[PDB]
Each structure stands twice: as structure tokens, then as C-alpha cells.
Symmetry: D2
Subunit: 215 residues, 4 copies
């Protein structure tokens, strides 16, 4: 179903602090190597008045390298696909709600993303655009009443030396009945390789590998 080589197509519609925007992207990646890359383009609502880094983790766990001992819930879910729902909590009250419906058409993954952020203070690092990079993150994946859950508590490094924490809460629902994995982790590293000035064009890279902890 899934080759070592797939393509990505996505459109994200949303609003941050009530003001709408839209982004389209095309990208590519390798599911067995856990790596993906994409090019993002702002279509509506640009220039964006908020930090672009609050969107990068919304721009697909099929691009995670899974060992044999860990059940791969996302590669099993195809060709039917899966969707995910997520709440992002920033330590100063900012809230981001995001959804992604992932389907597969041949060799291309298609995303239907919806994003909504509220309560970002105007003097905060997101509205002042004082963010630099997201630190590498560890995700906890576990089953709870028949669904797969994902929790991440990371931080954004602030242009200055500071760190801006965020808590992720994800729910993963496959379109067909698949086997559910056990408690495991997925390590992430997302990186902005290139943009212009107001982020109307963004080159985004991600690297993810699943593991089973220290023991």
C-alpha cells in the first residue's frame, strides 16, 4: 500500500485570534525512513500576524520509522487512512485546536486540515513573533477506551534565549478497524529549512522515529 516513496498534498484553513488565513502545500517523504519534507504557501490572510512555528506540527505519523516489535497503527490504517484531532496548550493561555483528515490517492497523501487558535496575548512570543525553533520532542502513544492517544510537552526556543512551553493532546482514529499498539514513544524533530520574510513560502522538514523507552 505504502511504498518507500510518497508525496504530500495539503490545504490548511483556519484562524488565529479570530482572523482567518489559508495555506496550501506540496511535499514528499519516505515512510520507512521516517523523513518528510514540504513546501508551504500562504493563500489567504497573509502576511501572517502570528508566529509560523505554531502551525508546523500540524503540517502525519505514517512518516515515522517503526521497529518490528512496535505495532504501526498508521501504516496499517491505509489505504483507508486515518484522521486526527489535537489541542495545543501554550503556557500563557494560547489555545490551538487542529484537525487533519488524511486520505490516500495513489502515491500522494492528501490532508484536509482545520486550525483554530485563540487567547494569544498581543505581547506574547506568538503575536510578537519571537520564536525561533521547536525543540526535539518525545510523544507518548497509548490506548484509552479503544482509541490511540498522543501527548507531547515541548517548548519553543524564544529569540532571546528563553523557552516557551506547549502541551499537545492528540487523538488518532483510523477509518477501519486496525490493531492497537502498546505504550511506546515517537521522537520528533521538525525544522524550517527555508522561508522568505513573511513566511508566505516555507520549506519544512520533519524526522520521526518510534522507540520503546529506556529498558
Amino acid at each position: 500500500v505504502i511504498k518507500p516513496d510518497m508525496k504530500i498534498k495539503l490545504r490548511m484553513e483556519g484562524a488565529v485570534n479570530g482572523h482567518p488565513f489559508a495555506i496550501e502545500g506540496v511535499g514528499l517523504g519516505k515512510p520507512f525512513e521516517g523523513k518528510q519534507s514540504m513546501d508551504l504557501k500562504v493563500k489567504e490572510g497573509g502576511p501572517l500576524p502570528f508566529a509560523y512555528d505554531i502551525l508546523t506540527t500540524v503540517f502525519n505519523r505514517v512518516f515515522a520509522k517503526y521497529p518490528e516489535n512496535i505495532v504501526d497503527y498508521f501504516k496499517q490504517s491505509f489505504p483507508e487512512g486515518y484522521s486526527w484531532e489535537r489541542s495545543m496548550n501554550y503556557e500563557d493561555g494560547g489555545i490551538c485546536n487542529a484537525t487533519n483528515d488524511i486520505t490516500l490517492d495513489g502515491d500522494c497523501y492528501i490532508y484536509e486540515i482545520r486550525f483554530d487558535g485563540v487567547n494569544f496575548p498581543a505581547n506574547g512570543p506568538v503575536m510578537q513573533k519571537r520564536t525561533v525553533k521547536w525543540e526535539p520532542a518525545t510523544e507518548k502513544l497509548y490506548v484509552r477506551d479503544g482509541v490511540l492517544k498522543g501527548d507531547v510537552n515541548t517548548a519553543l526556543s524564544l529569540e532571546g534565549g528563553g523557552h516557551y512551553r506547549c502541551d499537545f493532546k492528540t487523538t488518532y482514529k483510523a477509518k477501519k478497524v486496525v490493531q492497537l499498539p502498546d505504550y511506546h514513544f515517537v521522537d520528533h524533530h521538525i525544522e524550517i529549512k527555508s522561508h522568505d520574510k513573511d513566511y508566505s513560502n516555507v520549506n519544512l522538514h520533519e524526522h520521526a522515529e518510534a522507540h520503546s523507552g529506556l529498558p
Copy 2:
């Protein structure tokens, strides 16, 4: 500009757990009585698979009775109007993000509402439709960085006696420079007086009175 009798026109567009919907309403109210009433109709995405009660607190603090000891920020902001954002944090992980842009057209208040809820468990009271009503609530409205904020922790009474808590975090932004009030309260009471089976037609009643607390 503020009339003893005002009407409301509103359209809400949103999604709960990724599934879109749209609702329109018309109503009227007495801003100096702190009372308002409206008729809401589902236009898209019906029948709703979630409890309708999670939307009623999103369908305007101008309908709050304000005493002269407290600065009335919401009646002061017209005819330019004001907007508010809100995150609703339920105790089982469900998160709802809502925005409202309120303008004034003659004697009619126009709401442009966007709603988005995620991570509502399928076995929880919102998706299982086991909510009865909202309990009466008190909000504290206070200034932080020159903007008005509102905090509520209320609960929904469940079919069987239990209570399902929610915490509100609202940011109120007036369109023009307005006078900021001091730390005060607003008591509220929202009630669904009539509805259809699947809530395609809902009559919603709300009563609010501002005060400055125990002395």
C-alpha cells in the same frame, strides 16, 4: 445607540470532533434587563451528534445588567462593537475554541461565530448526549495588558445527578478605545426552554447581572 430593545442576527460555523456544522439564529433582548432570547436553527451538519449545550454559551455581554458602580465596557464599545475569543476546557479533555465578532446594524446585533471542539471522547457526556443544563455561573472580568478578560468555571448537570465541569477563558476586545472596568463579576443563567428532538430548533434563554461581590 443602545436601545431598550435590540434584536440579534447570528450565524455560527464550526465543527466538533472534525465534523462541520452551521447554525443561524434570530432573537431579541433587553440590554438593561440583562435578558435576551433567541431562536437557533441548524443549517448544516444535522442531526448534531454532540450535546447542544456546549454551544449555548457561544450564542454577548451587552445583555448584562450593569450597575453604575462598575464600568460597562460592552455598552461603551458601541456602535463600533467588540469581539471576544474563548477556550472551553472540559474535565475529560474536550476543548472548544470559539470566536465572535459583534457589530451593530440599526437595532440588530450581528454575530459572526466560529466554533471548534476537539478530543471529545465517544463515551463521554457530550457525544453521548447526557447533559441536562448549565448550572448558574459567575464570571470574573478583570484587566490584563489593557484588555478585558473573563474567567468562568461552571458545570453541566448530567442525566443522573452528576456534574461535568468546564473552565472558560475569554478575551474581550472592543473596537475603539474604551474605559476599562475594575475587577467585578457577572452572574449568569442560561437555559434551553424549548427544542426539537435532535435540536434542529432550539429556543435559548439567558439572564445576566453584573456585581462587585461580597462586601
Copy 3:
């Protein structure tokens, strides 16, 4: 069982950010009229390096004026008494855990209080003492699994202005089987009347009344 006048004697043993301290108190109040006052003296660990305002809300819902229409869980629980636990989460990461065992000895209420605060930043208003007063607060009380719970979301007023928020979560356990009230509220107003300069002696007043939310001249 409860007279129109009751006395208070209390002992607090605790710590903030790991450094111990101690406070004893004597007081008096009117349970039917929701008013109480006490004089607290610091015994150990003074002068206190933290804002005194984080403890005053730990220094009795029996001193809350209850209407006849709402069941009083605390006045009903006597003469055996009740105990309560509380977690306080300030918006800056500061966490306070408090427990209180309330007994009745004649006409005097006796408290056994334990206080522990952690994760208070050295640059914050609690460690640097920039608190002025608690704003008036409302508490919601509801039953959950046979016990009474109390949630309050209040704030502290700051020296230069602004507010410093705190979230309360209280559990009330009566010692005997009493019956549980319905979802109701209690309005609070706590105030430090007089104190010296390191708060080794503090005069504290509180006023509390229960009600049932937003609802005649006769």
C-alpha cells in the same frame, strides 16, 4: 450544638519551597452570620520569606451564612466534625497543598493544619511579596462520590496593579453520615486588618455566605 458564638484555636505546621514555618491562632466568629476573626502569631521560621496572603485562605465553612433553602454540610457534621484537603495552583506554577482536621471541644473549634508550597519562583509576587489582597471570591460546591467538593477561581491584587490568579480544589469529608447539599455557591471575602511589618502578628477577618446563583420589596 453550635452556638451563636464560637471560639477558634488552630495550629499550622508547614513549609514553603522546602523551608519550614509555624503559626498558631486564636479567634472567634458567628457561624450563623458568616463572620470570624483571628489573631495569628508566627512561631517557627519567621520572618516568613513568602507572601502571607497564600495562607490566609487556609486559616472553616462552618462560618458561612447558609439560607434555610440550601443544606449546610458543615454545621450538620458537628459535633464530630469534618476535615478538608486543598490543592492551590497559581498561574506561575506555584502549588500549595493544605489539609485541615477540624474538631469541636465545647464551644471552640480546633484545627490541625498542614501547609506545603512548592515551585514558587524567586522572581514572583509570592517570593517577593507583591501581593496586596485577595479579591472577593465565589466558591462552587457540588457532590461527587459521596463527598462535597469546592472549586474557586480567584486572584490576588498586586502592588503595581494587576491580578495574580489562583485555582482552588477542595474536598470536604464529614466524619459522620450527613446529607449532601445541591449545587450551590458561597461568596467569600477575606482581609488582613492589621499586621506588623514581617507578618509575625496578623489580624484576619473573613465573611462568607452561601447562595444558589442568579434567581420584590416585601
Copy 4:
């Protein structure tokens, strides 16, 4: 100052839901292999009416294997030592506040722990003792206002399935001026190897290793 063989002496006294207890322990570590071991004993307030697992993560980041690429804040603090504070937020409202002042006496680490848990429901996995083990954890360490902070988000496994989440927030304060590290991680694993029937005697082990996240297997 930090030897390949260290001993542990500890006393923890606190209360869960208002009911006091006291625990004594003795142990030994290998501060360079990130492994520690200890045997613990209940002295007051036993038999414990709560799950013992809510205390095990309170029984020393000096027993974490630190590579040279990451600055070691905890090995720098000895022999004068450091202290830490922690709030543990369970997902059903249980809250635990714990503090530990660690000193160094010759070749032995001395702990003075104070623990306080409240709002634990009587029908919950802690008071009903339905916890099995802690899952492996990753902690995030970072500097804020000149001190080192620690964030952990793990779960506890329960009898019959499922997980019971808890969120850790730790503050590390060295007693003397040390060099502050950059954003890094420490992987943890807690396990009770042997215990009694009433958990009056517990043998506890830990293994901790620091790293810097998703980056060595060049095969040479």
C-alpha cells in the same frame, strides 16, 4: 567528589489525604552509569493505604548517566549539594507536592524528603491500589530564571488495562553557582523488584540516561 561507588541514606515523611506516614531507606549508586538501588522501610503510618508507586519517583538526578556533550548540573553541585521541589498532577485531581534536600556526607548521599498528597479519590487507582508499574519516562530539562527545571509526563499502568497519567514539574536549585546546561533530556525507568505484602519493605531500582533528542550508529 563523585566516586564510582556511592551510598544512599534517606528519610521521607509526609501524608496522603491527611494521614501521616514515615519511610526510611538505605541504598547505593553508580553515578556514572545512571543506576541507583535502594531498600525502603515503613516506620510510621503503616500499613500504607495508598499505592506505593506515587512515592517511588520521589526516592536523585545525580544517578543519571551524562555524556560529555551535555553539561551536568547535578554532578557539579556536589559536595555542597542541591535541593529540588516537585508538584505531581494526577489526571483525576490527585496532587502531590514533594521536596528533597540532598547533601553529601563522605561517600553517602543524604536525602530529607517531605511529601504531601491531597484530593485523591477513594474510588481511584491510588487509594484502591490498582497501579502496577510506571512506564518509562522522558524528562525535559531546561533553564528558566537561572535555575534548572524538569518536566515529565508519564502514566502508571493499572490492573485490568489502561494508564493513569501524571504530570511532573520539578525545580532544581544548586546550593552553589554551577554552569547551566542547555535544553536536553533524561530517560528514566522505575521498577520495584521486591516488596512485601503490605509494602512495608520495598526494593527499588532506577536507571537514568541523559540525551539531547533525535540527532552515532555509524558502525565505528
